[model samples]
Target: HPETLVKVKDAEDQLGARVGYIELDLNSGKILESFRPEERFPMMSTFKVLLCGAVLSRIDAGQEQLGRRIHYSQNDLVEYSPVTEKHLTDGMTVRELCSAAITMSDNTAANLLLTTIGGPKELTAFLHNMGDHVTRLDRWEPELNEAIPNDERDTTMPVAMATTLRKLLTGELLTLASRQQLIDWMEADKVAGPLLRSALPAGWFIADKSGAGERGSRGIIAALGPDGKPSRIVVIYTTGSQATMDERDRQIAEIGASLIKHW
Candidate 1:
């Protein structure tokens, strides 16, 4: 398994992209494997997971309520907002918006939740409060996914993402019910295709959030392991490739396969 990192490097070279990935044992807090884990990659829709988490934290503090309904007009709809676009008239509850944003990557739903949480800066402050200095949210959907090279806007380090996800899901950050709700949202993710999930063996559980953007950037943050426990947390990202998105996905899939094999 010493060749795991080498295979990751080879995949990055083959795709002509940069890959940043980290896998941690949830129970032990030990990093089992990584490649360029400290480097930054555009967060894309992946930020929705954290965005919703911050909202859940507010709920725990009694500042927000899940039953609160928020209504928006047609003009509020943005590109790729499949869920919110349909319910513009009736609107949706805070819980439903979180589900839409996390499970479906609904752009409008994310913006609505972002506004409720007080915009991108507030979410960045949430991350800061969680002691995650490397992850940040500077813009809203669509524009946030620009993925321009060397621009740190709306970006996260793989290690920071993995750690933050672990804290939100398993650490003392949220109440038990709140953490379980976050897990449920991630488990219900519909945006992840045959990328990292495809590489896992049969019957292994994975609760994840996936993102795609300009410049062929793609990423997944997940808790995956056997027996439905998902004891391992994984974050994988790729950027700066002109290759097709499929190619980028396959490269990440290859990295996933290597990690699973090693672990």
Candidate 2:
């Protein structure tokens, strides 16, 4: 903790209040360093990290289809939220929805996916038992306006979540086909634009998932670009950036890139 505190404090006041990060040597499968990587914090939208395994497991077990269609309900709406109030359907199959869930962080799409697959509870258990204990689902569904009050619900350590991502990215999560599909889908995530995308080189193969709130969260997995020898996987999260999306985007970009250099 002390060693990490030195690293974190160096960048803490520079960005938001504090910055949290974790990175791995994909070639070596080692944690270079992490602080508060395991402490529970507002998951923001990073909760999706917990769902990738479920998405793939369901497909592998034939319990669900990757290319399934989804519908939305305003009744399930959470105030000012995106998924519950949206009214539309996709000609796109379940596979397309999966892509939106990761790439675009489409709330309605991911919420619909939770139901289409097995909901948050089921996926949480699946992920936890797999050794990624730092992350878990916040709801059985990502419903918008449930009467349930928002409480002090929290999420996993950054290290555990990032480790899960690396494992999956490294083809350690599910079948080879599933891993590739997720990597493709994750690269499609909409939420990543502000968080990780800003930090990476133009051509790097980035796969990531993000979380949101008045404060926010993000998890990223990076593969060195096909353009160079920059082959590695890194996972990081940032929170307490009390700024507009645009402002947070720059912060995420600047800090995320710095970690890329530091790690």
Candidate 3:
């Protein structure tokens, strides 16, 4: 275990930067390795994963329908989103919005989902009931236009995030079908090659989401081992990078490969 810690440190050192990361044993619900596991970091778009819990809960409760259609106005659009740009139509289903939010990292779609699920008030309540204390789903992407400091943005502790991911898979907060649907969208996440996917060995599968903002990059991965059993849940949140993003990604890529050796 000490060797594993050393390896994780080496991975961070390779970036010559500040990093907070955690590896959790999903089956045993124990932390396998960590750096500042209790420290908080700006979640960027990774908060969308947390937002999905409320949406799925409503769907499971029959209060909302996944096939419900949501329309976007010019006001809902965020900068640089191809989903809004490329769509010939102005609307998509709740399922399509969820897919675009995670797989394509569309801010508008995420905003739609967050608002439809009763905004931050409802999402916070859902997370509280689900036992996640350190993650804040307090604002939408549009709210970032108000000049909020990055540190003041939505945040999560590594341990808190890993626990949330585990709860999703273990059905503590969602039905099996809802869990599968959420994971499927995450598995399709585009710009996807950054975090755990690089080092994933053959036969293993990772349902993951990657995020970046003005501060730095982050990602969460729910990985099943080669035998198809829940193996690990990893959260890597980075900031204050001295290396270029290219090299920073290299460090993260190596970390994933090395982490697999222990599993």
In terms of lDDT, the best-performing candidate is 1
Clashing pairs in 1: none
* C-alpha local distance difference test of each model: 0.90, 0.59, 0.73
Q: Which ten residues in a row have the lowest lDDT in candidate 2?
A: 143-152
Alpha carbon deviation, residue 79, candidate 1 (Å): 0.8
Residue 58 of model 1 has an lDDT of 98
Q: What is candidate 3's lDDT per residue for 1-263, written digit by digit as tens?
A: 45656766886677665567788887888888888798777777777777776788888999889999887777677764668556636588888778878788788888888889888778777887889877776777855323233564477787888888888876557889998888888777776686678788777877787767553454455545676555778888776655666777777777677778776
Q: For model 3, what is the C-alpha lDDT against the true structure? A: 0.73
RMSD to the hidden true structure, all candidates: 1.0, 4.3, 2.4
**Cα lDDT for residue 39, model 3?**
76
lDDT of 1 at 84: 94
lDDT of 2 by residue, 1-263 (tens): 24434545654565455456666666666776666666655555565555655777778888877656555545544333343344453244577656655666666556666776567677677777788765666563333212122333445566766667667667565888987777666666665676666766755666667665554333344544445443455555555555566665565566566665654
Q: Please report the TM-score between candidate 2 and the true structure.
A: 0.78
Total clashing pairs for each candidate: 0, 29, 0
lDDT of 1 by residue, 1-263 (tens): 56678877987898888988788889978998888889999999989999999999999999999999999998888899989988977899999999999999999999999999899999999999998998999999889999999999999999999999999999999999999999999998877867778898888888999998999898899999988789999888889888887778888888888888877
Candidate 3: segments with Cα more than 4 A from true spot: 88-90, 142-152
| Candidate 3 Cα deviation (angstroms), residue 171 | 2.7
Per-residue error at 231 for model 2, in Å?
3.8
